[PDB]
Amino acid sequence: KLPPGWEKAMSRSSGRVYYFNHITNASQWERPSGEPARVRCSHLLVKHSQSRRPSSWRQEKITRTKEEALELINGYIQKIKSGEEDFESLASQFSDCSSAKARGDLGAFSRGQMQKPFEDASFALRTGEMSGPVFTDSGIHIILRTE
Numbered sequence: 129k130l131p132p133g134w135e136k137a138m139s140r141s142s143g144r145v146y147y148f149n150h151i152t153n154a155s156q157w158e159r160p161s162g163e164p165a166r167v168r169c170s171h172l173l174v175k176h177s178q179s180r181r182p183s184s185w186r187q188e189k190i191t192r193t194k195e196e197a198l199e200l201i202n203g204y205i206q207k208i209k210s211g212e213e214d215f216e217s218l219a220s221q222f223s224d225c226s227s228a229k230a231r232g233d234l235g236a237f238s239r240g241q242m243q244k245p246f247e248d249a250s251f252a253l254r255t256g257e258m259s260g261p262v263f264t265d266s267g268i269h270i271i272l273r274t275e
């Protein structure tokens with residue numbers, strides 16, 4: 129019996145089975161196996177032209193499309209997963225959130241405080257686990273649960 133949130137899938141390019149989480153948008157090859165008052169997370173945000181506030185410390189006027197933002201997110205996830213780059217380094221350089229200055233750290237929080245897709249992903253992640261692309265009214269997030 130798989131844990132809730134998780135489903136079995138089959139690659140497409142290779143035919144090998146993998147597991148996908150529809151709350152975190154994480155995917156992995158191994159069987160996942162398996163809630164607290166509070167969690168601590170970091171994130172990397174890529175905004176797009178339909179973000180609630182299409183502006184950030186990186187760019188006064190953010191004009192990229194949502195599709196372009198998802199491509200950027202997917203590229204950062206690839207480099208993090210390969211070890212070519214660290215999550216903290218990419219967040220500091222490229223997150224459209226002012227938390228970039230703290231390597232993406234948002235600190236600890238409870239349910240009720242964050243936007244719902246962000247909250248649900250954060251609480252479904254295990255400690256140390258990274259999400260896939262998570263969509264909110266702010267943009268597209270990579271979320272790292274640190275505690």
Ligand SMILES: CN1CCN(c2cccc(N)c2)CC1
Binds near residue numbers: 227229230232235
């Ligand atoms: C929406 N953002 C506002 C800025 N934030 C921030 C800024 C500096 C350092 C840390 N840890 C967090 C919180 C999240």
